[PDB]
Amino acid sequence: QCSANEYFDSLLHACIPCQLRCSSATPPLTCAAYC
Amino acid sequence: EVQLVESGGGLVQPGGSLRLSCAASGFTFSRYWISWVRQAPGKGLVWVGEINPSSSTINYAPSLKDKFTISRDNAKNTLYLQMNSLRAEDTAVYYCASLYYDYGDAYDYWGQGTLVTVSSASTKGPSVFPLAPSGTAALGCLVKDYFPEPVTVSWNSGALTSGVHTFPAVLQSSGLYSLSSVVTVPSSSLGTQTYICNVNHKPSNTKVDKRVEP
Amino acid sequence: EIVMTQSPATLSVSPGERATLSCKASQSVESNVAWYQQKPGQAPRALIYSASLRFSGIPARFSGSGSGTEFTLTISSLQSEDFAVYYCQQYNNYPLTFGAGTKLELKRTVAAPSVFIFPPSDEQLKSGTASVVCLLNNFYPREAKVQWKVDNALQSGNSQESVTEQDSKDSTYSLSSTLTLSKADYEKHKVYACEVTHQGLSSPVTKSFNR
Ligand SMILES: [Cu+2]
Ligand SMILES: [Cu+2]
């Protein structure tokens, strides 16, 4: 369960911000709305 | 300082069991995932399994379903690995590790690993033999025939490290390991200095201090 | 499982230059690849966790990229402390699978080996075994030949050899070749030579001894 500005990374088992992926290469499919 | 000290683990014939402990201290062990990873001698890494904080979701590796069992005790801030019915393919250095993402940054901490040797061969200590000193000279120290690993070698209780080279162990056709430790010293430093190679073998619990001279 | 194909197996490059590794995935794992560093004797050290996102305390020179089935870690400007093994890992699908692992070595000036040969000690003769050792210390690169010739008889199949990793200071290798023989066979031949051929030797250097 992550907010609308975060995706879940199974390696760290924690919600990672989308900003770190939006402004950097192709973000995950779930962050396309936050960019 | 964060730490993940790993105890337990050593030698055991096939089919036997062996429990491992991975004690933590320095970070909230009870709020992160902690996993296991083995590394067979001279090979890559292998994901054994992981476990969540509340122990409500344990993910193993299919090929190792029945062998290993993972559990944790948050009260003692320690992870466990209960290995059952192992084989020679299950020999490796078992590391524990924990990854998380707090404070806005991603971290990762590892234990120092512990060697687990699965084999039916019996423990034997090394048989030390000197190497005859041949404008730079050279002498050594043959550590032949010993099981299991490892074996440590130093010169003069650690008072000689310039040019010392201890080569990795190599398993002979007899299932036993053998390595050499050589050193480069001035040619004229023979009739004036004394050179000793002290070999230790914690498994066999041996200790050989051999003097090398022409 | 998902096979992560990581090439090249070994890469030789000098500090300050560039290094780009590759890791191909058996099947699309999306952006869920990591990158670790492991040095001889220590545990792995993670560097990337989302194919580009870096861990804490990891210099900015480490740059990871790629998605789907092809990922590449780029070490822009190399440093002495950055020469080690590097793995790739996927965690999009269980179980988590690693890569074979590339190893970085420090490309330095060529160095010829200092050959030595140690006849078997009289202590070992009582055991009934014979181990004729031949040392090749201080040479770059690691690609060196070390043959045996018992009375000009080029041996084969009865001589192993291990090697040390790159030295901290001079980043030079050291090789030992052990010819294992029987006590009876050792005392029915007199010459035990060790022919060394390396890039740093115009002609194959050789040194032997008489029993
Ligand atoms: Cu040396
Ligand atoms: Cu013969």
Cα distance between residue C86 and residue A11, in whole Å = 18
- CA-closest candidate to residue B170, choices C161, A26, A34: C161
B102 touches B109 (CB < 8 A):
no
- CA-closest candidate to residue C101, choices C51, C58, C44, C59: C44
CB contact under 8 A, C32 and A10: yes
C99 touches C5 (CB < 8 A):
yes
Q: Among all residues of chain C, which has the CA nearest to that of B4?
A: C43
Cα distance between residue C80 and residue C84, in whole Å = 9
Residue C141 preceded by cis peptide, ω within 30: yes
Cα distance between residue B46 and residue B14, in whole Å = 20
Task: Please enumerate in sequence order all residues whose Cβ is within 8 A of that of C126, keeping only pairs 6 or more positions apart, or say none.
Answer: none
Say yes or no: B108 and B134 in one domain. Answer: no
* Tokens of residue C141, six digits: 């690169």
Residues of A in contact with C96 (CB under 8 A): 11
Backbone angles phi, psi at B125, to 5 degrees: -80, 170
B22 touches B6 (CB < 8 A):
yes
Backbone angles phi, psi at B158, to 5 degrees: 100, 15
Query: How many domains, chain B?
Result: 2
Amino acid, single-letter form, for residue C110: V
Amino acid, single-letter form, for residue C4: M
Q: What is the CA radius of gyration of chain C?
A: 23
Alpha helices in chain B (DSSP H): none
C165 touches C189 (CB < 8 A):
no
In chain B, % helix, strand, coil (3-state, to 5) comes to 5, 55, 40
Cα distance between residue B201 and residue B119, in whole Å = 18
Tell me if chain A has a CB within 8 Å of the CB of C28. Answer: no
Say yes or no: B178 and B138 in one domain. Answer: yes
* Tokens of residue B23, six digits: 């004690």
A19 touches A7 (CB < 8 A):
no
Rounded to a whole number of angstroms, the distance from the CA of A6 to the nearest CA of chain C is 13
Domain boundary among B118, B149, B182: B118
Residue with tokens 């964060």: B2
Q: Among all residues of chain C, which has the CA nearest to that of A10?
A: C91
Residue with tokens 């230059």: C17
Residue with tokens 């194909």: C5
Task: Please enumerate in sequence order all residues whose Cβ is within 8 A of that of C17, keeping only pairs 6 or more positions apart, or say none.
Answer: C77, C78
H/E segment holding residue C124 = helix C122-127
Burial annotation C26-53 (CB, 10 A radius, 16+ → b, else e): eeebbbbbbbbbbeeeebbbbbbbbbbb
Question: Considering all CA atoms of chain C, what is the largest pairwise distance in Å, rounded to the nearest integer?
Answer: 66
Question: Three-class SS of residue C163?
Answer: strand
Q: Which ligand is nearest to the CA of B161?
A: 1
A11, A27, A28: residue with CB nearest C49: A11
B53 touches B109 (CB < 8 A):
no
Task: Determine the number of helices (DSSP H) and then strands (DSSP E) in chain C.
Answer: 2, 18
H/E segment holding residue B39 = strand B33-39
Say yes or no: B107 and B146 in one domain. Answer: no
Cα distance between residue B181 and residue B178, in whole Å = 10
- CA C60 to mean position of chain CA atoms: 27
* Tokens of residue C175, six digits: 């090789």
B184 touches C115 (CB < 8 A):
no
Domain hosting B132: range is 127-212
C43, C56, C98: residue with CB nearest B95: C43
* Tokens of residue B201, six digits: 């073998």
Rounded to a whole number of angstroms, the distance from the CA of C15 to the nearest CA of chain B is 23
Say yes or no: B8 and B110 in one domain. Answer: yes
C35 touches C64 (CB < 8 A):
yes
B182 touches B131 (CB < 8 A):
yes
* Tokens of residue A20, six digits: 């770190």
C84 touches C101 (CB < 8 A):
no
Q: Among all residues of chain B, which has the CA nearest to that of A13?
A: B100
The data reach a resolution, in angstroms, of: 3.1
| B17: CATH | 2.60.40.10
Mutation choice for C interface testing from A2, A6, A9 by most C CBs within 10 A: A9
Q: How many interface pairs between B and C have CB atoms less than 8 angstroms apart?
A: 112
- CA-closest candidate to residue C165, choices C84, C88, C80: C84
Backbone angles phi, psi at C161, to 5 degrees: -160, 130
Q: Which residues pair with B171 in a beta bridge?
A: B177
C210 touches C178 (CB < 8 A):
no
Say yes or no: B83 and B141 in one domain. Answer: no
Say yes or no: B112 and B159 in one domain. Answer: no
Amino acid, single-letter form, for residue C66: G
In chain A, % helix, strand, coil (3-state, to 5) comes to 25, 25, 50
Say yes or no: B26 and B90 in one domain. Answer: yes
Cα distance between residue B79 and residue C90, in whole Å = 23
CA dihedral C137, C140, C142, C145 (to 10 degrees): -70
Domain boundary among B118, B149, B170: B118
The count of other CB atoms within 10 Å of the CB of residue A4 is 9
Backbone angles phi, psi at B48, to 5 degrees: -75, -65
Residue with tokens 């060394």: C196
Q: What is the CA radius of gyration of chain A?
A: 9
Cα distance between residue B59 and residue C93, in whole Å = 12
Domain boundary among B93, B118, B143: B118
Question: Considering all CA atoms of chain A, what is the largest pairwise distance in Å, rounded to the nearest integer?
Answer: 24
Q: C5 vs B18, B41, C192, CA distance in Å?
A: 33, 20, 44
- CA-closest candidate to residue B152, choices B208, B112, B201: B201
Chains that touch C (3 or more CB pairs under 8 A): A, B
Q: What is the CA radius of gyration of chain B?
A: 22
Q: C181 vs C128, C150, C184, C195, CA distance in Å?
A: 9, 11, 8, 18
Q: Which domains does chain C have, with CATH numbers?
A: 4-106 (2.60.40.10), 114-207 (2.60.40.10)
Cα distance between residue B107 and residue C120, in whole Å = 52
CB contact under 8 A, C119 and B163: no
Amino acid, single-letter form, for residue B32: Y
Question: Three-class SS of residue B213?
Answer: coil
Residues of A in contact with B106 (CB under 8 A): 12, 16
